[PDB]
Design a protein around this ligand. Structure first.
Ligand SMILES: CCCCCCCC/C=C\CCCCCCCC(=O)O[C@@H](COC(=O)CCCCCCCCCCCCCCC)COP(=O)([O-])OCC[N+](C)(C)C
Ligand SMILES: CCCCCCCC/C=C\CCCCCCCC(=O)O[C@@H](COC(=O)CCCCCCCCCCCCCCC)COP(=O)([O-])OCC[N+](C)(C)C
Ligand SMILES: CCCCCCCC/C=C\CCCCCCCC(=O)O[C@@H](COC(=O)CCCCCCCCCCCCCCC)COP(=O)([O-])OCC[N+](C)(C)C
Ligand SMILES: CCCCCCCC/C=C\CCCCCCCC(=O)O[C@@H](COC(=O)CCCCCCCCCCCCCCC)COP(=O)([O-])OCC[N+](C)(C)C
Ligand SMILES: CCCCCCCC/C=C\CCCCCCCC(=O)O[C@@H](COC(=O)CCCCCCCCCCCCCCC)COP(=O)([O-])OCC[N+](C)(C)C
Ligand SMILES: CCCCCCCC/C=C\CCCCCCCC(=O)O[C@@H](COC(=O)CCCCCCCCCCCCCCC)COP(=O)([O-])OCC[N+](C)(C)C
Ligand SMILES: CCCCCCCC/C=C\CCCCCCCC(=O)O[C@@H](COC(=O)CCCCCCCCCCCCCCC)COP(=O)([O-])OCC[N+](C)(C)C
Ligand SMILES: CCCCCCCC/C=C\CCCCCCCC(=O)O[C@@H](COC(=O)CCCCCCCCCCCCCCC)COP(=O)([O-])OCC[N+](C)(C)C
Ligand SMILES: CCCCCCCC/C=C\CCCCCCCC(=O)O[C@@H](COC(=O)CCCCCCCCCCCCCCC)COP(=O)([O-])OCC[N+](C)(C)C
Ligand SMILES: CCCCCCCC/C=C\CCCCCCCC(=O)O[C@@H](COC(=O)CCCCCCCCCCCCCCC)COP(=O)([O-])OCC[N+](C)(C)C
Ligand SMILES: CCCCCCCC/C=C\CCCCCCCC(=O)O[C@@H](COC(=O)CCCCCCCCCCCCCCC)COP(=O)([O-])OCC[N+](C)(C)C
Ligand SMILES: Nc1ncnc2c1ncn2[C@@H]1O[C@H](COP(=O)(O)OP(=O)(O)OP(=O)(O)O)[C@@H](O)[C@H]1O
Ligand SMILES: Nc1ncnc2c1ncn2[C@@H]1O[C@H](COP(=O)(O)OP(=O)(O)OP(=O)(O)O)[C@@H](O)[C@H]1O
Lengths: 666, 558
């Protein structure tokens, strides 16, 4: 499935891939024609002197005047003199020997009394021969000079030509990869906005960030590897193999016999490297964890004199890690490049065997040009092996990361709904013996039935683990009640879009979140839909906070550090300011501050008083002192509303409020 | 190139292995210099008249022999060098961890955990890479390029050599410049990706608010924009990254065609031969590498020097905060006294203690009360030798703590910090932690006398509010300290468990000193000596009875 999805995302942007492939093909074609130019230069011009020569006239018709007689090569012949006048130029040792006579056999050569004997092991016809000094040879080589120049030009021309296409393709491919990843990223984030709240509750916030970003990076590396290395190497090897077959078919098959070598090498190297690398990484993770847990909280390590044992464990880890590093080194020292050099020298030996075998046969021709072409092609062919094997071993991590991202994408149980609200809530809200269970067969709220009037400050006060926060979750539809029913102004909550509902309400939580950025954007949550109504902070208070430095309507940015520098009281203050700025109809206060301080909570009380006005407020708190004025308190036990009424009515029977108010003081 | 000068100890300790490695490297280079020449000679001899099966067999044999020799020698010198690098990593890890163990809290206040973990995870890799691979590349770039150059010069020709090596220097220079600039752009792109990764955490941790205010579309827009920024950075990197293969191909093709063309020109003038031409081609083919080797060497050397000059600081320059001296002859602590102790934390100009004076007898229980931040726990720090002695005198029966061995002093005391420091081992190891795993039986007692074996019965042994505190106090009691110190040990449980706990500890520890720091004053009732600490001084001191006959001091609960 991973391969299918990767191919599907690659199919997008297929124009870039097609263009890059074509450019790469042209570049490789030119780079590999170069050696044909070199081979022709060598053979057809240097070794063409050994080809026959025929005497002719002297009108510079491709002829060279040896002493007083002009000759022309057979290739540059117009049949003026072909059969009677046949000349040759052999070379024995370092000397070049001109024979002015026709010949029949060809084999080993020696000169004893000027009679160049060509034995060949069958019979030796001795022909008188001369030496050509050092300048006469030049005169037989002079004409070819022009041809070579042209050939040279071609090389250079093609060379610079080829250059441009490489830069063309490597770029495009990269872009392709990057672009695909970008698309992928967007998709995942979109899906994140459609998952239920459960998904986030039952999984740490750290892992989802990793899944969104680091796994996308791993897939990007996978794409870069695949394209740039594998496709390029495949095309390059196919081109080299085409060239070799065009040159000589016999050695082409021998050179084709190397592919199983690469196959087996890659298989074995992967088989061992995967295991050793896995052990190394696990041990390094353990070492880092041990070092961290020791560096933190070392006071008891020193107090109880545990230094020796911790050092013992650390050295055990160190010994194992060092051992596996050495094993990986052994594997490398037996495959990484030594095997390449062995194969390279073995190829040299094979070339020598093949060509020297033909030479001794006395029938085949050495054709040094083909030798040059093959050495060049094999040097280019043996280059990409180490990469190929390394990334082949490494592919597995990326394959697992891609699997993870795709199983994330393919989730089915998602939320699909969205629209702005079209009417003002009016704050009527009712409950109908709702009963919600978080996971299963364990009920946290049972038969919760109540009604809240337009009068605000309807607090829910109970005990720890009594099922108060679940009311907030059911009210914002973060979770479905699974039983009963909830009504907003006579309209069912479960018959309308979630965003529309959340548009009617507001929330303040225990930990006010301070998004990185400026205050103005933070107060408006970078909505951009609202004008300078952030001045609503004033309604809370001023406290000279804008006067301390710059302004908080997009002019001050003290939140870049998560708001740690700002006081916690100021954090809740900006939370209330945002809640009022959005100006909802129903306000829910989830406050569980562990210390009033009796100094920093006056501002919170004032903000609650100023914001609760003209709304329907639910105050989720257990202080029972700021909620003295509530129009209606509600106390529930183990998920059931045991008692309900006003503070005065609930003080008609002393009970729970009595115990709290009495034992809490001092 | 000073890293090798700063690592003299390692090479002096491991000199034989590196000597073998370098000798094998030189021998391998020389022996590997032949095969191109052998092929050149074989080609040059095929053309000539004389060539027999003997030459064929000889060439095959010599090629195989040279191949085997290079294979084995390469294996062995790589073994030696990379094993040396691994040993360097091992040694450095041991040194760093030991030094970290032997330090005191003040050192950890100046140095953040991130830097130490970096120096234990990054600098070591760089230094090991310097000792192994930088030396490998030095050997190559210095000798390999010289031997190939002087083999081509003397065996083949000098005009051809000088003419065909012109492009390689500029190729290397261009590679170096590209490497520097691409590293800069890569750092920029990595910074952009980090900036992206910061935003996703905020938009995923604060999911409730975003959905509550239907702001997910704005979060989508912001994420898409930052992804576009990351893409632009990546393309700016790829702009420079796509310049490696063109330059290398162009400037190697130039050298190869100069070789071929000008060598054919010389073959016409008869100074060269065909065999020499192919040998020259192969020599260039193997000469391509030192160009890259030079840049690799420079980069690794600079990185290694940067890492090492930094590791030596937090591994050597720091001196232990507290130092023992000639051990004194004392076996057990008689009485603990404070003679006008004055002390200030290193990282603050506030006193936190102003000539505190009191005394403690054997079996004496001392109670300390006060408000938060009034130097309640600073006094105990003045006794655990976690900071410089400062000023004053704290004599154990008549001798200042300075003479008591640090090993001996830790043996007497039993610390229970207010914070929860429980190591991620099994519960059994956490409690044996104090005893250093001497025996198993008294663990069940230790927990029973802690009256918290009930909690153990209500949890499966392994892994791992008040559970941490009970485990910590049990661990402290394992060692049977002669001076037991509790620093708000029982805060989660109040007036129901802690009372019986302290009663049982007091009755069990009868002739042993005990210190109780606690915010609640109900739990220090039986303490025959109680002190109230306000600011840097002690406002009042006396028995619990006297307390009742003094200013009402946070007794406004019962
Ligand atoms: C070798 C194992 C034994 C096979 C025996 C049986 C042979 C039967 C013959 C069947 C005919 C099959 C025709 C070819 C189709 C390819 C399918 C594919 O996706 O391949 C794999 C992609 O690999 C991965 O899952 C991850 C790695 C992808 C990138 C690797 C690059 C190349 C590496 C290596 C080269 C360097 C996954 O396989 P799949 O999930 O089965 O594919 C289902 C594809 N479908 C959904 C479109 C139908
Ligand atoms: C089966 C459908 C075949 C067909 O005609 O349509 C298919 C095209 O046809 C093809 O080109 C062959 C099928 C492509 C399979 C890709 C497998 C993963 C490749 C390796 C990926 C490695 C990373 C790159 C398209 O339909 P499909 O179902 O998408 O296939
Ligand atoms: C164009 C088509 C014109 C055809 C007719 C020209 C004939 C001619 O006059 O040539 C003349 C040049 O011949 C030489 O001797 C040249 C020797 C050097 C050649 C190197 C060229 C430059 C190398 C770089 C190549 C491109 C690099 C590109 C890089 C990317 C003929 O001269 P000659 O008579 O043979 O002289 C021998 C001396 N003697 C007569 C005294 C004995
Ligand atoms: C897919 C096609 C790829 C792409 C392009 C293929 C065509 C390229 C140009 C060909 C023209 C050419 O150079 O002439 C030559 C090739 O002539 C032939 O192509 C046919 C006649 C010779 C057959 C021998 C080579 C077979 C493989 C060729 C294709 C390679 C691709 C397959 C291998 C991967 C003339 O032959 P020659 O120069 O005398 O040398 C022959 C050697 N021999 C004498 C030992 C027999
Ligand atoms: C291009 C890419 C191609 C992809 C093709 C994919 C083909 C798909 C799957 C694999 C298909 C290939 C054959 C698998 C056989 C495995 C087997 O027999 O078990 C064993 C071989 O034990 C033996 O008997 C040795 C001979 C077989 C393996 C080597 C073949 C050559 C396996 O190896 P081992 O000996 O246990 O060594 C492991 C050592 N270690 C534990 C330390 C790590
Ligand atoms: C145990 C199961 C069997 C183990 C031996 C299997 C062959 C291993 C092999 O070839 O890989 C070797 C190199 O690879 C070469 O040998 C490359 C060719 C070099 C010569 C040319 C590397 O493998 P090894 O580390 O030498 O052997 C494993 C040793 N172990 C089993 C203790 C881990
Ligand atoms: C290579 C070349 C370096 C050779 C020395 C160059 C001179 C440097 C100047 C110098 O201070 O003297 C040097 C002399 O020489 C030494 O004692 C060598 C120092 C270790 C070098 C290890 C090279 C490893 C090569 C791997 C292949 C340094 O030693 P010193 O200073 O004489 O020693 C006294 C002071 N000290 C101990 C604090 C260093
Ligand atoms: C993996 C495959 C390997 C085996 C495959 C073939 C097996 C045999 C084939 C089949 C036919 C067998 C025919 C008979 C055997 C011949 C003798 C013999 O075996 O000699 C062997 C032992 O030789 C030595 O090691 C000693 C000789 C060394 C001479 C060194 C150079 C001096 C001569 C230089 C003279 C002028 C040259 C100038 C340049 C220096 C080696 O062979 P040689 O080459 O004779 O040596
Ligand atoms: C470290 C470099 C070693 C070279 C290995 C060559 C292997 C190939 C040789 C040989 C090929 C194989 C064996 C020969 C077979 C028979 C041949 C018919 C010619 C040498 C001429 C003398 C050159 C030195 C002159 C002094 C200058 C000073 C010398 C300075 C150093 C010169 C370095 C070249
Ligand atoms: C840094 C330095 C650069 C300085 C270059 C000086 C240039 C002087 C003129 C050219 C010259 O003499 O080159 C010299 C080489 O050159 C060398 O190898 C080194 C330079 C001085 C050598 C002096 C002659 C040595 C004897 C050598 C007597 C001959 C002459 O040698 P060549 O002929 O250039 O090359 C040999 C080619 N052949 C063996 C095929 C003949
Ligand atoms: C991108 C691809 C680029 C490809 C470029 C391909 C170019 C290769 C061309 C090969 C043929 C060179 C001949 C040039 C020439 O005209 O000869 C002259 C230069 O001769 C040289 O020595 C120049 C050799 C090339 C210089 C280095 C190029 C790279 C620079 C970076 C001199 O020749 P001569 O024989 O010494 O003269 C004898 C003196 N007399 C004439 C007075 C008698
Ligand atoms: N997402 C959740 N998944 C599973 N169980 C949950 C979830 N949220 C809360 N619970 C559990 O359901 C019960 C409801 O308790 P609730 O969160 O309402 O506590 P509370 O009375 O509001 O106290 P506090 O405000 O201190 O958290 C508890 O057992 C709680 O741990
Ligand atoms: N790590 C420290 N570095 C510097 N000064 C410190 C440090 N910890 C505390 N102080 C200073 O010492 C005083 C507080 O001492 P300490 O925290 O030991 O007493 P305490 O807070 O009353 O004890 P407890 O934490 O048990 O309530 C304050 O004046 C404070 O500024």
């Amino acid at each position: 499935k991973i391969g299918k999805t990767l191919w599907r995302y690659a199919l997008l942007y297929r124009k870039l891939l097609i263009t890059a492939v074509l450019l790469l093909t042209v570049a490789v074609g030119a780079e590999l024609t170069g050696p044909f130019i070199g081979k022709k230069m060598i053979d057809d011009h240097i070794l063409g002197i050994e080809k026959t020569w025929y005497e002719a006239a002297e009108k510079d018709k491709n002829a060279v005047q040896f002493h007083g007689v002009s000759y022309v090569r057979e290739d540059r012949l117009q049949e003026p003199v072909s059969k009677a006048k046949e000349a040759h130029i052999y070379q024995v040792g370092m000397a070049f020997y001109f024979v002015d006579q026709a010949v029949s056999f060809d084999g080993n050569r020696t000169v004893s009394d000027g009679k160049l004997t060509i034995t060949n092991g069958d019979k030796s016809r001795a022909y008188a021969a001369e030496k050509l000094t050092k300048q006469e040879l030049f005169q037989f080589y002079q004409p070819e000079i022009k041809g070579m120049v042209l050939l040279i030009a071609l090389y250079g021309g093609l060379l610079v030509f080829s250059v441009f296409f490489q830069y063309g393709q490597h770029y495009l491919l990269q872009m392709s990869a990057n672009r695909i990843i970008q698309k992928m990223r967007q998709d995942v984030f979109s899906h994140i906005q459609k998952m239920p709240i459960r998904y986030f509750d039952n999984l740490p916030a750290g892992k989802v960030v990793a899944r969104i970003t680091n796994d996308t990076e791993a897939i990007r590396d996978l794409y870069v590897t695949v394209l740039s290395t594998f496709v390029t190497s495949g095309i390059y090897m196919f081109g080299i193999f085409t060239a070799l077959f065009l040159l000589d078919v016999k050695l082409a098959f021998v050179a084709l016999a190397i592919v199983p070598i690469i196959w087996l090498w890659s298989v074995i190297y992967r088989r061992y490297a995967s295991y050793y690398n896995q052990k190394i990484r696990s041990i390094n993770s353990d070492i880092n964890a041990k070092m961290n847990e020791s560096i933190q909280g070392m006071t008891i390590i020193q107090a109880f004199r545990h230094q020796k044992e911790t050092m013992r464990e650390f050295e055990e880890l160190n010994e194992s890690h060092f051992y596996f590093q050495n094993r990986m080194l052994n594997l490398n020292s037996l495959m990484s490049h030594n095997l390449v050099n062995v194969i390279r020298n073995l190829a040299f030996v094979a070339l020598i065997w093949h060509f020297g075998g033909a030479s001794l046969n006395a029938a085949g021709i050495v054709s040094i040009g083909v030798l040059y072409a093959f050495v060049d092609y094999l040097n280019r062919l043996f280059q990409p092996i180490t990469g190929i094997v390394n990334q082949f071993s490494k592919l597995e991590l990326a394959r697992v990361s891609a699997g993870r991202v795709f199983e994330l994408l393919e989730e089915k149980n998602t939320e699909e709904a969205g629209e702005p609200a079209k009417e003002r809530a009016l704050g009527r809200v009712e409950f109908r013996d709702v009963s919600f269970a978080y996971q299963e067969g364990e009920e946290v709220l049972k038969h919760i039935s109540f009604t809240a009037q337009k009068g605000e400050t309807v607090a829910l006060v109970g005990h720890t683990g009594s099922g108060k926060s679940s009311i907030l979750n059911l009210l914002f539809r973060f979770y479905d009640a699974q039983k009963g029913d909830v009504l907003i102004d006579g309209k069912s909550i479960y018959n309308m879009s979630r965003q529309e509902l959340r548009s009617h309400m507001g929330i303040v939580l225990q930990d006010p979140y301070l998004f990185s950025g400026t205050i103005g954007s933070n107060v408006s949550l970078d909505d951009e839909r609202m004008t300078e109504e952030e001045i609503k902070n004033a309604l809370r208070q001023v406290g000279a906070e804008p006067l301390l430095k710059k302004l908080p309507k997009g002019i001050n940015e003290p939140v870049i550090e998560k708001g740690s520098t700002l006081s916690s009281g100021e954090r809740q203050l900006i939370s209330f300011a945002r809640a009022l700025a959005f100006d909802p109809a129903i306000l829910i206060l989830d406050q569980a501050t562990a210390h009033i301080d009796t100094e920093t909570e006056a501002v919170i009380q004032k903000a609650l008083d100023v914001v609760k006005q003209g709304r329907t407020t639910f105050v989720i708190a257990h202080r029972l002192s700021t909620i003295r004025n509530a129009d209606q308190i509600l106390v529930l036990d183990k998920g059931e509303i045991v008692e309900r009424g006003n503070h005065e009515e609930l003080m008609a029977l002393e009970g729970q409020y009595y115990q709290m108010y009495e034992l809490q003081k001092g | 190139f000073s890293v090798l000068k700063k690592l003299g100890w390692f090479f002096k300790a491991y000199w034989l292995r590196y000597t073998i490695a370098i000798v094998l490297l030189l021998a391998v280079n020389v022996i590997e210099m032949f095969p191109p020449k052998l092929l050149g000679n074989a080609i040059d001899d095929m053309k000539a008249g004389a060539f027999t099966a003997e030459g064929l067999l000889f060439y095959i044999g010599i090629f195989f022999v040279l191949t085997a020799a290079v294979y084995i020698m390469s294996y062995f010198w790589m073994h030696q060098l990379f094993g040396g690098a691994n040993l360097m990593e091992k040694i450095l890890r041991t040194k760093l961890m030991g030094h970290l163990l032997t330090m005191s809290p003040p050192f950890y206040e100046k140095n953040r955990t991130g830097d130490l973990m970096a120096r234990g995870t990054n600098d070591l890799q760089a230094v090991s890479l310097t000792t192994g691979f930088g030396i490998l590349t030095l050997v190559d770039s210095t000798m390999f390029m010289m031997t190939i150059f002087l083999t081509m010069g003397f065996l083949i020709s000098w005009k051809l050599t000088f003419a065909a090596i012109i492009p390689l220097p500029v190729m290397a220079i261009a590679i170096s410049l590209y490497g520097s600039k691409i590293h800069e752009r890569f750092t920029e792109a990595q910074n952009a990706f980090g900036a992206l990764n910061d935003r996703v955490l905020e938009s995923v941790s604060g999911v409730r608010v975003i959905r509550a205010y239907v702001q997910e579309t704005n979060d989508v827009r912001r994420f898409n924009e930052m992804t576009a920024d990351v893409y632009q950075k990546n393309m700016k990197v790829a702009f420079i990254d796509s310049l490696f293969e063109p330059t290398v191909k162009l400037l190697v093709g130039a050298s190869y065609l100069i070789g071929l063309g000008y060598g054919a020109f010389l073959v016409f003038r008869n100074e060269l031969t065909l065999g020499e031409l192919v040998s020259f081609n192969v020599y260039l083919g193997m000469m391509i590498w030192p160009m890259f080797a030079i840049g690799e060497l420079i980069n690794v050397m600079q990185r290694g020097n940067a890492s090492l000059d930094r590791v030596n600081e937090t591994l050597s320059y720091e001196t232990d905060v507290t130092d023992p001296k000639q051990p004194a002859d004392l076996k057990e602590p008689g009485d603990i006294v404070f003679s006008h102790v004055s002390f200030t934390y290193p990282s603050s100009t506030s006193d936190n203690l102003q000539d505190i004076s009191f005394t403690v007898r054997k079996g004496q229980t001392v109670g300390i009360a006060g408000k938060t931040g009034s130097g309640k726990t600073t006094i105990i720090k003045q006794l655990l030798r976690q900071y410089p002695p400062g000023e004053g005198s704290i004599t154990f029966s008549g001798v200042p703590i300075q003479q008591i061995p640090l090993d001996r002093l830790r043996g007497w005391i039993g610390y229970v910090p207010q914070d929860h420091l429980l190591f991620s081992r099994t519960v059994k190891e956490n409690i044996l932690y104090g005893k250093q795993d001497a025996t198993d039986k008294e663990v069940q007692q230790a927990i029973a006398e802690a009256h918290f074996e009930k909690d153990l019965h209500m949890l499966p042994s392994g892994l791992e509010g008040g559970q941490k505190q009970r485990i910590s106090i049990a661990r402290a009691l394992m060692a049977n300290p002669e001076i037991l110190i509790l620093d708000q040990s029982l805060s989660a449980v109040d007036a129901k468990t802690e009372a019986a706990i302290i009663k049982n500890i007091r009755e069990n520890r009868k002739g042993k000193t005990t210190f109780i720091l606690t915010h609640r004053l109900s739990a220090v009732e039986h303490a025959d000596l109680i002190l109230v600490m306000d600011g840097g001084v002690i406002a009042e001191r006396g028995t619990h009875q006297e307390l009742l006959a003094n200013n009402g001091w946070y007794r406004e609960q019962y």
